[PDB]
Coordinates of C-alpha atoms and ligand atoms in Angstrom, one line a residue:
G6 CA -6.0 -22.0 -4.0
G7 CA -2.9 -22.8 -2.0
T8 CA -0.8 -22.9 -5.4
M9 CA 0.3 -19.6 -7.0
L10 CA -0.7 -17.9 -3.8
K11 CA 2.0 -19.3 -1.5
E12 CA 4.7 -18.5 -4.0
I13 CA 3.6 -14.8 -3.7
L14 CA 3.9 -14.8 -0.1
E15 CA 7.1 -16.6 -0.2
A16 CA 8.5 -13.9 -2.6
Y17 CA 7.1 -11.1 -0.6
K18 CA 9.0 -12.6 2.6
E19 CA 12.3 -12.8 0.8
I20 CA 12.1 -9.3 -0.2
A21 CA 10.8 -8.2 3.4
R22 CA 13.6 -10.1 5.0
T23 CA 15.8 -6.9 4.5
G24 CA 13.1 -4.7 6.3
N25 CA 12.1 -2.4 3.5
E26 CA 8.4 -3.3 4.0
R27 CA 7.7 -1.3 1.0
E28 CA 9.5 -2.8 -2.1
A29 CA 8.3 -6.1 -1.4
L30 CA 4.6 -5.0 -1.5
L31 CA 5.4 -3.3 -5.0
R32 CA 7.1 -6.5 -6.0
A33 CA 4.0 -8.3 -5.2
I34 CA 1.9 -6.0 -7.1
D35 CA 4.0 -6.3 -10.0
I36 CA 3.8 -10.3 -9.7
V37 CA 0.2 -9.9 -9.6
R38 CA 0.0 -7.2 -12.5
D39 CA 2.0 -9.6 -15.0
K40 CA -0.5 -12.3 -14.7
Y41 CA -3.5 -10.0 -15.6
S42 CA -1.6 -7.8 -18.1
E43 CA -0.5 -11.1 -20.3
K44 CA -4.4 -11.5 -20.5
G45 CA -7.0 -9.2 -22.2
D46 CA -8.1 -7.8 -18.9
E47 CA -7.6 -3.8 -19.1
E48 CA -10.0 -3.2 -16.1
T49 CA -7.6 -4.9 -13.7
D50 CA -4.2 -3.9 -15.1
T51 CA -5.0 -0.4 -14.8
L52 CA -6.3 -0.8 -11.2
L53 CA -3.3 -2.5 -10.3
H54 CA -1.1 0.6 -11.8
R55 CA -3.1 2.9 -9.6
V56 CA -2.6 0.6 -6.6
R57 CA 0.9 0.4 -7.3
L58 CA 1.4 4.3 -7.4
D59 CA -0.7 4.7 -4.3
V60 CA 1.5 2.0 -2.4
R61 CA 4.8 3.8 -3.7
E62 CA 3.6 7.4 -2.8
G63 CA 2.7 6.3 0.6
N64 CA -1.3 6.6 0.5
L65 CA -2.1 2.9 1.1
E66 CA -5.7 3.7 2.5
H67 CA -6.8 4.5 -1.0
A68 CA -5.1 1.3 -2.4
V69 CA -7.1 -0.8 0.2
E70 CA -10.3 1.1 -0.7
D71 CA -10.2 0.6 -4.5
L72 CA -9.0 -3.2 -3.9
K73 CA -11.8 -3.6 -1.8
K74 CA -14.2 -2.4 -4.4
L75 CA -12.4 -4.7 -6.9
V76 CA -12.7 -7.6 -4.7
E77 CA -16.3 -7.2 -3.8
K78 CA -17.2 -6.8 -7.5
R79 CA -15.0 -9.6 -8.5
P80 CA -14.2 -12.3 -5.7
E81 CA -13.0 -14.9 -8.0
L82 CA -9.6 -13.1 -7.8
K83 CA -7.5 -14.8 -5.3
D84 CA -3.9 -13.1 -5.8
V85 CA -5.5 -9.7 -5.9
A86 CA -7.2 -10.6 -2.6
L87 CA -3.8 -11.8 -1.2
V88 CA -2.0 -8.4 -2.1
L89 CA -5.0 -6.5 -0.5
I90 CA -4.6 -8.4 2.8
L91 CA -0.8 -7.7 2.5
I92 CA -1.3 -4.0 2.1
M93 CA -4.0 -4.1 4.8
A94 CA -1.5 -5.5 7.2
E95 CA 1.2 -3.1 6.2
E96 CA -1.2 -0.2 6.6
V97 CA -2.3 -1.3 10.1
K98 CA 1.2 -1.3 11.6
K99 CA 1.5 2.5 10.2
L100 CA -1.6 3.4 12.3
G101 CA 0.2 2.3 15.6
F102 CA -1.6 -1.1 16.5
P103 CA 0.7 -4.0 16.6
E104 CA -1.7 -6.6 17.7
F105 CA -4.3 -6.1 14.8
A106 CA -1.1 -6.4 12.7
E107 CA -0.5 -9.8 14.1
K108 CA -4.1 -10.8 13.6
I109 CA -3.9 -9.8 9.9
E110 CA -0.5 -11.5 9.5
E111 CA -2.0 -14.7 10.7
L112 CA -5.0 -14.2 8.5
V113 CA -2.6 -13.8 5.7
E114 CA -0.7 -17.1 6.5
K115 CA -4.1 -19.1 7.0
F116 CA -5.2 -17.5 3.5
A117 CA -1.9 -18.6 1.6
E118 CA -2.2 -22.4 2.8
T119 CA -6.0 -22.6 1.9
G120 CA -7.9 -20.4 -0.7
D121 CA -11.1 -19.8 0.9
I122 CA -12.4 -16.1 0.7
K123 CA -13.9 -16.2 4.3
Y124 CA -10.5 -15.2 5.6
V125 CA -10.0 -12.2 3.3
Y126 CA -13.5 -10.7 4.8
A127 CA -12.3 -11.4 8.3
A128 CA -9.0 -9.3 7.4
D129 CA -11.4 -6.4 6.5
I130 CA -13.2 -6.4 9.9
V131 CA -9.6 -6.3 11.7
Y132 CA -8.6 -3.4 9.4
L133 CA -11.9 -1.6 10.5
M134 CA -11.0 -2.1 14.1
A135 CA -8.0 -0.3 13.6
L136 CA -9.8 2.5 11.9
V137 CA -12.3 2.5 14.7
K138 CA -9.6 2.4 17.3
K139 CA -8.1 5.5 15.6
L140 CA -11.2 7.6 15.4
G141 CA -11.6 7.4 19.6
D142 CA -14.4 5.0 19.9
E143 CA -13.8 2.0 22.1
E144 CA -17.3 0.6 22.8
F145 CA -17.5 0.1 19.1
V146 CA -14.3 -2.2 18.9
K147 CA -16.0 -4.9 20.8
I148 CA -19.1 -5.3 18.4
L149 CA -16.8 -5.4 15.4
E150 CA -14.5 -8.2 17.3
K151 CA -18.0 -10.1 18.0
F152 CA -18.7 -10.0 14.1
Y153 CA -15.0 -11.0 13.4
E154 CA -15.3 -14.1 15.8
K155 CA -18.8 -14.9 14.2
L156 CA -17.2 -14.8 10.9
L157 CA -14.5 -17.4 11.4
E158 CA -17.1 -19.9 12.2
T159 CA -19.9 -19.1 9.7
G160 CA -18.1 -17.8 6.7
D161 CA -20.9 -15.5 5.7
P162 CA -19.8 -12.6 3.3
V163 CA -22.7 -10.4 4.8
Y164 CA -20.9 -9.7 8.3
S165 CA -18.4 -7.2 6.8
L166 CA -21.1 -5.2 5.4
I167 CA -22.5 -4.6 9.0
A168 CA -18.9 -3.8 10.0
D169 CA -19.0 -1.1 7.2
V170 CA -22.2 0.3 8.6
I171 CA -20.5 0.4 12.1
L172 CA -17.5 2.2 10.3
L173 CA -20.0 4.8 8.8
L174 CA -21.5 5.3 12.3
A175 CA -18.2 5.8 13.8
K176 CA -17.2 8.4 11.3
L177 CA -20.5 10.4 11.6
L178 CA -20.0 10.3 15.3
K179 CA -16.9 12.4 14.8
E180 CA -17.3 15.1 12.1
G181 CA -20.3 16.7 13.8
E182 CA -23.3 14.5 12.4
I183 CA -25.6 12.2 14.1
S184 CA -25.1 12.2 18.0
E185 CA -24.0 9.5 20.5
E186 CA -27.4 8.2 21.4
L187 CA -28.5 7.1 17.8
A188 CA -25.0 5.8 17.4
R189 CA -25.2 3.4 20.5
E190 CA -29.0 2.4 19.5
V191 CA -28.0 1.4 16.0
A192 CA -24.9 -0.2 17.1
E193 CA -26.9 -2.2 19.6
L194 CA -29.5 -3.1 17.0
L195 CA -27.1 -4.3 14.4
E196 CA -25.2 -6.3 17.0
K197 CA -27.9 -8.8 18.2
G198 CA -30.0 -9.5 15.3
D199 CA -31.9 -6.5 13.7
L200 CA -31.6 -5.1 10.4
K201 CA -35.3 -3.8 10.4
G202 CA -35.2 -2.0 13.9
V203 CA -32.5 0.0 12.4
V204 CA -34.7 1.3 9.7
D205 CA -37.4 2.2 12.0
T206 CA -35.2 3.9 14.5
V207 CA -33.5 6.2 11.6
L208 CA -36.9 7.1 10.3
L209 CA -38.1 7.9 14.0
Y210 CA -35.2 10.0 14.6
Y211 CA -35.4 11.9 11.0
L212 CA -39.1 12.7 11.8
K213 CA -38.7 13.9 15.3
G214 CA -35.9 16.1 13.8
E215 CA -32.6 14.9 15.1
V216 CA -30.9 13.7 11.9
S217 CA -30.1 15.5 8.7
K218 CA -31.2 14.1 5.3
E219 CA -27.6 13.0 4.1
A220 CA -26.5 10.9 7.2
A221 CA -30.0 9.2 7.3
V222 CA -29.8 8.2 3.6
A223 CA -26.2 7.1 4.0
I224 CA -27.2 4.7 6.8
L225 CA -30.3 3.6 4.9
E226 CA -28.2 2.9 1.6
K227 CA -25.7 0.9 3.7
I228 CA -28.5 -1.1 5.3
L229 CA -30.0 -1.7 1.9
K230 CA -26.5 -3.2 0.8
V231 CA -26.6 -5.3 3.8
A232 CA -30.3 -6.5 3.2
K233 CA -29.5 -7.0 -0.9
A234 CA -27.0 -9.8 0.0
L235 CA -29.0 -11.6 2.6
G236 CA -31.8 -13.0 0.3
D237 CA -34.4 -10.9 2.0
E238 CA -37.3 -9.1 0.0
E239 CA -39.3 -8.1 3.0
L240 CA -36.4 -5.9 4.0
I241 CA -35.2 -4.6 0.5
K242 CA -38.7 -3.2 0.2
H243 CA -38.6 -1.4 3.6
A244 CA -35.3 0.0 3.1
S245 CA -36.5 1.2 -0.2
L246 CA -39.5 2.8 1.2
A247 CA -37.5 4.5 3.9
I248 CA -34.9 5.9 1.4
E249 CA -37.9 7.3 -0.9
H250 CA -39.4 8.9 2.3
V251 CA -36.1 10.3 3.5
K252 CA -34.9 11.5 0.3
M253 CA -37.6 13.1 -1.5
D254 CA -40.3 13.5 1.1
Ligands
ZN315 ZN1 -9.0 5.7 -6.5
ZN316 ZN1 -42.9 12.3 5.7

């Protein structure tokens, strides 16, 4: 929390002064992995092995994915989160977006001289913007920006989950799954305040015969994940009933 985290960023900056932009990441991953190999944690050392291999090969997206999983299961880890944000910032610059890279860099700077996890989550949303900005959508970036602004003034770890749902909608809107109208309706429902009208809209579109049994369950499980970290038991039951109806019946 402000210590043992600023040294990692300082070393990253020294090894990035050259301009390699890839050996600094590997050195930071090494620094993190040494602190967790000296312990008796064999679940994190192997994960950092895989992450370093992915970064060295060039497949940083898999690294950000599995580091995201790690930081979600265990948010106590703060150097792992710092290296995750560094890899996110490095990957964003490869996608072709220089202003999102600047936003993530300032997020790293504010995370180093603090220790609050509320910035890490914010970085995720910025990262997601890049992804959403690459799939083609432009009207989905604004909702993500609104969530990003609302995270930096509330610090709720439940606003990145809605961004994950929006990313899922953007992904399905491209491949050939659920069409534009449902995407816009669900985005509008997730935007304002509704996580219960989303369930009803998905069910209504499923019964009317406009959504497959796989995309509907994907959206419903994402909504259940959002509703399991909000302290709601009148929406966990609703999501469970909807998943039961769509899945089997
Ligand atoms: Zn993996
Ligand atoms: Zn039925």
